């Protein structure tokens with residue numbers, strides 16, 4: 001060219017106004033956001049630029065002594081603490097003694113005089129990146145410096161940032177997340193200092209409850225680094241719509257202010273000062289409005305660092321929130337309530353797409369996907385009361401826990417507004433059996449696009465042989481018999497849930513049959529301490545063909561085979577066709593077999609059954625005998641006995657169709673895996689199990705026309721990954737909402753629950769001794785301990801703010817935790833014990 005070939009080159013420095021798109025690979029997370037954050041309208045971002053990773057690659061990843069070391073480090077694992085300490089020290093000093101090329105240090109001078117210049121104070125903040133992984137975060141992993149003035153001192157701190165990438169805490173963090181050193185770079189953000197009166201964090205969701213329609217703020221006096229620092233406390237405001245709706249005022253006894261000549265000092269605050277409302281209600285709203293605008297520009301809930309300097313609000317960071325369980329896209333207006341069928345089905349593992357397709361294509365009810373799990377919209381049932389109660393009463397009986405969640409929805413106020421005959425069961429089960437035998441024979445000849453065209457046929461046959469109106473009547477005949485028997489025997493004899501005792505050892509229960517038989521398997525293994533020792537050890541998926549080697553077992557094998565012919569097609573999570581079955585990987589069955597042996601006596605199929613009967617039959621006559629001791633006596637007892645006979649006749653079939661169903665699933669799954677196997681051979685698919693991420697139709701027209709789209713597939717995996725980390729509610733809300741005095745020390749709730757245990761740790765975290773089954777109490781908490789505390793059941797800290805470290809991490813690990821307590825380190829003497837709860841903010845003595 002005509003640009004002097006000047007011209008296909010990576011730059012060294014980029015202004016927030018220059019930063020291009022998806023150059024995250026140049027300026028990293030914090031930077032790419034700062035950039036985009038500038039280009040917003042009505043938002044004041046300070047100015048600055050980024051030291052591009054080129055500067056890091058050229059200065060430090062192109063040093064032989066450097067690379068030699070990083071190689072020496074790629075050797076270690078977390079178990080090796082000292083080597084890490086040492087190598088870290090060494091690597092770290094090499095960086096603070098590796099000067100920056102005069103070339104680069106001159107670009108900086110050039111830009112930095114535009115922002116400008118070397119007499120003004122700057123912020124040196126480190127934004128990092130992981131190659132070919134733009135959705136990785138280093139939140140709170142590296143250093144940052146406030147108020148750096150001067151060239152000599154700017155270069156000193158750019159180097160201390162790069163160094164902050166090699167701290168044990170940072171290193172160890174990459175080991176655990178398997179990010180690779182040498183694959184992580186650092187951009188450095190050089191930004192104008194703001195001397196603010198007040199600074200803090202803001203979330204455009206609620207941290208607890210993911211409301212999405214309520215914004216929460218954390219504010220304090222002074223510079224922000226203090227709040228993120230761990231001590232001082234903060235002020236917490238919550239804003240819904242344009243109304244302030246909570247104000248927790250804290251005791252901010254510290255603040256951090258700039259020095260005229262660089263650096264930062266910490267001031268105690270005059271007592272009158274420490275209880276002041278650090279924003280004024282006009283500013284709280286004026287601020288919330290901002291957070292809302294930003295969120296609108298990005299299209300997702302954001303995490304924001306802000307500054308208050310002479311009225312004015314400056315945005316100095318933005319981020320997305322990563323911890324939100326998503327919301328189904330239901331195109332139906334108003335406030336809606338979704339109920340998790342995950343929790344009903346007792347699964348609440350994420351489900352891959354192929355599996356989700358199948359659950360969907362067999363029910364005719366209308367369900368939604370969110371977060372990789374399934375939900376049912378139940379909003380209309382809740383309108384008409386004749387049906388509301390008609391609902392909550394049904395759940396109230398099964399899924400009782402689901403109901404409680406439901407009821408809290410019911411009064412948020414602001415939110416809303418015959419019996420087939422005895423030949424039946426038999427016939428029903430037979431034809432399911434026979435249907436499954438044709439299906440078996442029929443699919444092994446099918447292939448290609450036929451095979452798909454095939455199982456579309458069968459999904460109707462399935463619905464037809466498994467969900468007749470005879471079958472359903474049969475299912476309901478048993479269940480309705482329980483309802484009747486439970487309340488009517490409440491109202492006459494005053495004994496609840498009698499239907500459970502009357503149901504015991506009832507015939508034809510397909511699942512209950514299964515568990516008995518796996519008791520016998522266990523029973524075969526007890527005579528032979530050889531086997532049980534083996535099974536206990538083996539992590540071999542074919543441990544099975546290594547069974548006849550030892551005769552101590554080896555009968556063990558003919559046992560397992562018989563059991564795996566009648567049940568190998570089930571697994572915890574059967575409803576996802578994609579999940580691995582028992583007959584597929586027999587190792588997944590071992591632990592039960594083992595746990596039966598530990599916890600049951602031999603021959604317990606024999607006894608537990610019998611004592612099931614005898615007790616359901618002596619509870620049958622205890623009822624009836626007691627009934628005819630009252631008015632209309634003979635007619636009530638007469639009345640119930642038909643009901644019991646209905647109960648035991650149908651109750652076991654309740655369980656059959658799901659078995660009939662996943663039985664066909666498994667047959668599909670296998671023919672569906674031949675197709676995949678074939679596709680790989682043909683060259684279209686990398687792995688044969690790379691179909692679990694296509695829905696049925698998506699898949700079906702890949703075997704018709706052999707074309708696939710792999711960053712569909714890869715986003716699918718990337719996302720299935722993101723949702724496994726997530727734990728579905730019993731009730732999800734159109735607004736993202738997640739549903740389900742005693743000499744007391746008040747605090748900030750922060751994180752929901754209740755636990756009990758141990759004492760305070762001062763704590764020399766550096767030389768810290770912890771212990772299982774215990775609550776924690778320091779006063780300062782910061783990321784330094786993030787990678788240290790799994791063992792905890794609950795947290796309590798002096799410092800406050802619900803978006804402190806204590807909060808956000810206790811909220812992910814699922815611990816209940818209260819912060820902001822007055823003098824917890826003191827006032828909870830001698831590391832003793834305690835009971836805390838976090839749905840409200842209190843703490844007490846046991």
Ligand SMILES: Nc1ncnc2c1ncn2[C@@H]1O[C@H](COP(=O)(O)OP(=O)(O)NP(=O)(O)O)[C@@H](O)[C@H]1O
Nearest residue numbers: 123125139140144191192193194224225228305316
């Ligand atoms: N130019 C600036 N002027 C004033 N305060 C600033 C400026 N830049 C950053 N801050 C604040 O000073 C601190 C800078 O630390 P920073 O590393 O950027 O955030 P962090 O939480 O400590 N680490 P990270 O999780 O990577 O963002 C935060 O409290 C910011 O709110």
Ligand SMILES: [Mg+2]
Nearest residue numbers: 140228305317
């Ligand atoms: Mg930050």
